[PDB]
């Protein structure tokens, strides 16, 4: 048989994905793991390592995965995410989500990229007084449990690595670590924190955070959102095969660039030549310009040799570029090819499958985090945070404006819904309350 999933062995896959996202530099300083050495006998030798350096340096990294994620984020994040509930009361959550002035939308964007790239992340709502909606990287989460109690799937333990830098009098770089320790005993939430001082782990006693009213907590304030679902189990990154295609294309491009550098230049190849003729007339120097003509002895056949196109290496490179486009990942655009409008309408659902999955997962995760924050502050519970579920949004047509207002005159769409339609269509920017305040007055005329 085979182990469950990959036996939580996505560490190397996450590292490879991060290196691919970094760009050409990360791949080039990792050519040993990606591009196999053409010869091991050379690989041992020093001329072999110089040859491998020259082989890899001439290569070209295509970098389609970063463009894929950029396109997916652009499709997901248009206008701004919608927030439902008391906006005035939660403004001091939205503006500075973790005490840095960074808006919740930007942290949502970062978490969305983490979900799209390697399919893992984490939201941690802690209480300092002001609740803080943290964001925890995939590699930072280093423990999680599935003990099910009272016949219910429950997450009991979760420990994640938490990062910070110290500003000591001397600008000396001090990297110190904090390990938050979340546990669930008898269906009750307890935590402890660790402070590390260049290897001085100062442990704190177990503590019991409580809501504003009391009653403490029933579940851990931590959600692990993934591309697949918001489950503690490891979800597959959405770009695994995509990285494989990019790496294969990169090594094929390395071979192609070596061929172009070496055999791309044509040469004379003066066959049937005698060294006596050379030393007689050629004199170890051939002038090839159109002003001068070169003489040759009897029955000698000069012939320009250069490697031509349509070889198998470029054939494979074109195949792999086609494979990337065929996969459907919005990574590049093709000016050559054209698609009729309406044919892509049918497959728009399938193409945006990962987009919709990540959007809904992150929306649910942030909704749960906002519920926990409201619990901590004792505010309303009926709050939602839904991302843009309508991708490929463009400037809406005038007939679409006519349809929208005609629909609003009938009592089938709310005023806020109509305003959100217009805003998302790029036809208004002012808030609905502000427009109401301005338009409640008499007409200018």
């Amino acid at each position: 048989k085979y182990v469950r999933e990959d036996a939580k062995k996505m560490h190397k896959l996450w590292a490879h994905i991060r290196m691919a996202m970094e760009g050409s530099r990360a791949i080039k300083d990792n050519a040993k793991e990606f591009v196999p050495h053409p010869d091991n006998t050379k690989a041992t030798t020093p001329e072999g390592v110089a040859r491998y350096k020259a082989y890899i340096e001439r290569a070209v990294w295509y970098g389609a995965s970063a463009n894929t994620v950029d396109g997916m984020l652009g499709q997901i994040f248009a206008r701004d995410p919608v927030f439902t509930g008391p906006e005035d009361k939660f403004d001091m959550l939205i503006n500075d989500v973790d005490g840095s002035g960074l808006s919740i939308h930007q942290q949502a964007r970062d978490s969305a990229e983490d979900a799209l790239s390697l399919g893992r992340g984490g939201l941690f709502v802690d209480y300092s007084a002001r609740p803080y909606i943290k964001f925890i990287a995939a590699e930072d989460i280093l423990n999680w449990r599935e003990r099910w109690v009272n016949g219910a799937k429950r997450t009991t333990l979760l420990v994640f690595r938490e990062e910070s830098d110290a500003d000591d009098d001397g600008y000396q770089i001090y990297k110190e670590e904090v390990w938050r320790e979340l546990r669930l005993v008898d269906g009750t939430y307890w935590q402890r924190t660790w402070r590390e001082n260049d290897g001085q782990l100062y442990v704190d006693d177990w503590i019991s955070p409580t809501k504003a009213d009391g009653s403490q907590f029933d579940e851990i304030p931590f959600v692990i959102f993934g591309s697949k679902n918001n489950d503690p189990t490891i979800d597959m990154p959405p770009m695994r095969d995509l990285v494989e295609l990019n790496i294969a294309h990169f090594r094929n491009s390395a071979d192609y660039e070596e061929a172009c550098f070496i055999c791309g230049q044509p040469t004379l190849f003066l066959s049937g030549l005698t060294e006596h003729w050379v030393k007689n007339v050629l004199g170890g120097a051939v002038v090839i310009g159109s002003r001068d003509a070169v003489p040759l002895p009897v029955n000698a056949k000069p012939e320009l040799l250069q490697a031509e196109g349509n070889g198998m290496v470029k054939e494979a490179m074109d195949q792999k570029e086609r494979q990337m486009v065929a996969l459907g990942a919005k990574l590049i655009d093709s000016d050559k090819t054209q698609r009729t409008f309406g044919e892509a309408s049918m497959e728009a659902a399938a193409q945006n499958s990962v987009l919709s999955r990540v959007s809904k997962n992150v929306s649910d995760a942030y909704t749960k985090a906002l519920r926990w924050a409201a619990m901590f502050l004792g505010l309303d519970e009926k709050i939602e945070y839904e991302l843009n579920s309508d991708f490929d949004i463009n400037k809406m047509s005038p007939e679409e404006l006519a349809a929208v207002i005609s629909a609003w005159q009938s009592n089938a769409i709310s005023f806020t819904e109509m305003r959100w339609q217009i805003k998302k269509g790029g036809r208004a920017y002012l808030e609905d309350e502000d427009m109401r305040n301005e338009s409640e007055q008499d007409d200018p005329l």
Binding site: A15, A26, E139, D168, D169, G170, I173, K175, E196, G199
Partner: protein, 53 residues
């Protein structure tokens, strides 16, 4: 102490340089003012002040 061998964001990404083994945090308040570390330039190769006896 810190290892950070688990995740390699970059190759030897600030992970360790055995920066120093001696305690050198002995300046200003650290020495209770005894060894004051300041930043105020002066010219030449000296700094002479005169006070009455």
């Amino acid at each position: 102490a810190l290892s950070d061998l688990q995740v390699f964001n970059d190759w030897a990404y600030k992970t360790m340089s055995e920066v120093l083994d001696q305690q050198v945090e002995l300046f200003n308040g650290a020495t209770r003012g005894a060894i004051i570390l300041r930043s105020a330039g002066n010219t030449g190769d000296l700094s002479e002040a005169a006070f009455w006896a």
